[PDB]
Amino acid sequence: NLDADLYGYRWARDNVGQSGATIYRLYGKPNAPELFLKHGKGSVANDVTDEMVRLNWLTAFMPLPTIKHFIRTPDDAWLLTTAIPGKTAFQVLEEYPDSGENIVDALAVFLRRLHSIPVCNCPFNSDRVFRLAQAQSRMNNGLVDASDFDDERNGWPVEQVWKEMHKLLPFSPDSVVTHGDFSLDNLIFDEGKLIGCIDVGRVGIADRYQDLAILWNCLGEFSPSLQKRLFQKYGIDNPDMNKLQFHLMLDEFF
Ligand SMILES: NC[C@H]1O[C@H](O[C@H]2[C@H](O)[C@@H](O[C@H]3O[C@H](CO)[C@@H](O)[C@H](N)[C@H]3O)[C@H](N)C[C@@H]2N)[C@H](O)[C@@H](O)[C@@H]1O
Ligand SMILES: COc1cc2ncnc(Nc3cccc(Cl)c3)c2cc1OC
Ligand code: NA
Questions:
Q1: 181 has catalytic annotation
Q2: Looking at ligand 2, which residue's alpha carbon is closest to its atom 8?
Q3: Whether 24 and 111 share a structural domain
Q4: Domain range holding 13?
Q5: Which domain-ending residue is among 82, 106, 133?
Q6: Which whole-number Å values give the CA distances from 231 to 26, 145, 234, in the listed order?
């Protein structure tokens, strides 16, 4: 069982937009750090499982929550991790908009760090063909949230987004180690420093634009100038807009 690690903590049920899994926040225990327990049943358990192995693999390189405990049974996955103290990049942007330049600088450096991890270390695949297949299996089961499409695709039928996506293909792949969901909700700041990332479930090998696109979009809600810096700090001279557009369209399906 699990209980030894759970005496003393009190419980809260977070909703961070998290696909499928129930997230409990464990707190209140003195001399003990906040904890998260992710719980997935049925198919979603696979997803909790995927995150555990990636947390476990990736922490050899980046700063992650540590796996205090994981349980898999035929239909249920439970994942207990330590919390990363701090606020999301998004919150820190909102609260201190005269700090965006250092936050985007920090985000780029960090993303460069992740991507510099040599692929020969990484046992996980998440290239477009993998994701594309996944995206179809969510389209053709009507799980794609058309409500949440980016503005330039607002109210489009899903089967359209799908069709317009394959027009940009093909592009030259480049392969690095990617986060999978490099959004402003998933990087944790504290005392001005970037100190860790969360939500590592889609981590694997893919085109860098998988991470660059998603973050660049999030900074769309603040300043086109902030978006520019992201690419500028990272060191790309001319953003591959085709690639950007493809990855943003692929995220629509998840
Ligand atoms: N559905 C489940 C997913 O929900 C969010 O992802 C969605 C984005 O948020 C959407 O975009 C909107 O939100 C962005 C800021 O987050 C804005 O910049 C943008 N203009 C907005 O249209 C985008 N179209 C699809 C993407 N799947 C979570 O991050 C992700 O973890 C979670 O799995
Ligand atoms: C303070 O903001 C957060 C910190 C976090 N610190 C650690 N873990 C987080 N979430 C979490 C959710 C599921 C699984 C795991 Cl390992 C972590 C956190 C989520 C947060 O909300 C975005
Ligand atoms: Na680590």
A1: yes
A2: 83
A3: no
A4: 1-82
A5: 82
A6: 37, 28, 5
How many separate domains does the chain show?
2
> How many beta carbons lie within 10 A of that of residue 246, not counting itself?
25
Both structure tokens of 127: 């290239």
| Nearest alpha-carbon partner for 61 in 200, 174, 160, 251 | 200
Please, which experimental method was used? X-ray
- Residue 151's alpha-carbon distances to 60, 161, 220, 225, in angstroms, are 38, 12, 11, 19
CATH code, domain with 37: 3.30.200.20
Question: How does strand 67-72 pair with strand 22-27?
Answer: unpaired
- Cα distance between residue 249 and residue 114, in whole Å: 23
Give the active site residue among 181, 199, 207, 211: 181
DSSP element (H, E) containing 88: strand 87-88
CATH of the domain at 100: 3.90.1200.10
Q: Which residue type sits at 184? A: L
- Final residue before a domain boundary, out of 82, 103, 129: 82
Q: What is the DSSP string of 189-221?
A: EETTEEEEE---TT-EEE-THHHHHHHHHHGGG
User: How many CB atoms sit inside 10 A of residue 76's CB?
Assistant: 14
Report the distance separating Cα 157 and Cα 37, nearest Å.
36
In this structure, which amino acid lies at residue 154? Answer: N
Q: How many CB atoms lie within 10 A of CB 157?
A: 10
Residues 129 and 21 in one domain: no
Q: How far is the CA of 207 from the centre of ligand 1 (A)?
A: 19
